[model samples]
Target: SGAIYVGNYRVVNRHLATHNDWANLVWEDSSRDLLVSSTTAQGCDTIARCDCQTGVYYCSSRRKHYPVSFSKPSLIFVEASEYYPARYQSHLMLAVGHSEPGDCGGILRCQHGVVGIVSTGGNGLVGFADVRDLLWLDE
Candidate 1:
């Protein structure tokens, strides 16, 4: 009965993580990053970026911009049926990111090919979506 929260906004998954997908692929040899396809409302997706800048969650797809702040996101989990019922129990995952005590005050969890940023507040931020949605690269 709970919902996904992103800086005081309820979010929904637009694109769940998939195999070999550029947006969702996490390069272990690099800064350990990934993307989540989600949105604050239906029909629109936002790109949540999980970077290795020491617990920072950037909402921009191409750069370090739009930092979010969270309020006691004090917990994380990987469970099914929270969002995608189609993949229910087939690929259980949850938000997997980091949190800090600075400007971007909260956590950025990425899982099942999606991402969520929880915080108390932030500035210069926009909505989230799938990378494809943001770039119009989907066919």
Candidate 2:
């Protein structure tokens, strides 16, 4: 697998609970149709926007929308059935892909629709200056 980039913002390929039931999550840019799924064949390649089990997806606004029981520090206990809504919401994350770079990457929650830079340096990877400054990358 190669590096995944959300436009100019580079995405790290690993994180907490991106696959294995948790489904390496990715937040879709509200203005554009985007979703991240799982790529288990790569195993550690969780978080990259790609493919996974059916009907499991997450959107920008719904990342934190889950049952109280789903809250925990370990992704190992997470399940797709616990968080995803019974019916597709106005916003959604779709699970569909096969070794597609556009379908895999780590999850990042936006603050006020912007991902603030808590760090200062980077090879333009992990740390961000103003990465995803707005939920919509093209915005």
Candidate 3:
């Protein structure tokens, strides 16, 4: 039997984009922006931000993992603003990433309604609770 292959789930992100394609997506709205999220074997996590500028996968990590198993990222591109002034370019692109339930937010509604420690050391824009708002926006 073929070995079961698992990977990250992705969604269209409006706020962040890369430098290379940032101009096209953000300015022209090409609809090709993508965001990729994935988890580690042990459950630690890292979400990647790849856009026109970066032109590559840039991980947005809460907790760094070992192997960084980045399965084929499912693509998504939503209608929104994705631009950069430095490069003065913008376009639309699919954003992909992981979306599985993290170690946070299990049976007990704790960290931002997720069962994980929400710290500022590197949790990105907001804390655990704030993440709740962010995820809600995704919906």
Q: Report the poorest 10 consecutive residues by lDDT, candidate 2.
A: 66-75
Model 1 C-alpha RMSD to native? 14.3
For all candidates in order, the CA lDDT equals 0.27, 0.26, 0.22
Candidate 1 TM-score, true structure as reference = 0.20
List residue ranges in candidate 1 displaced over 4 A.
Answer: 1-14, 20-55, 74-139
Ranking by lDDT: 1, 2, 3
lDDT of 1 by residue, 25-133 (tens): 3221111112333333443233344332222344323334333333222222222223322221211122233322132212243332224332222233322221211
Could you tally the backbone clashes for each prediction? 18, 13, 50
Clashes of 2: 13
Q: Which regions of candidate 2 fall more than 4 Å away from where they truly are?
A: 1-3, 10-80, 89-139
The TM-score leader among the candidates is 1
Model 1: ten consecutive residues of lowest lDDT: 25-34
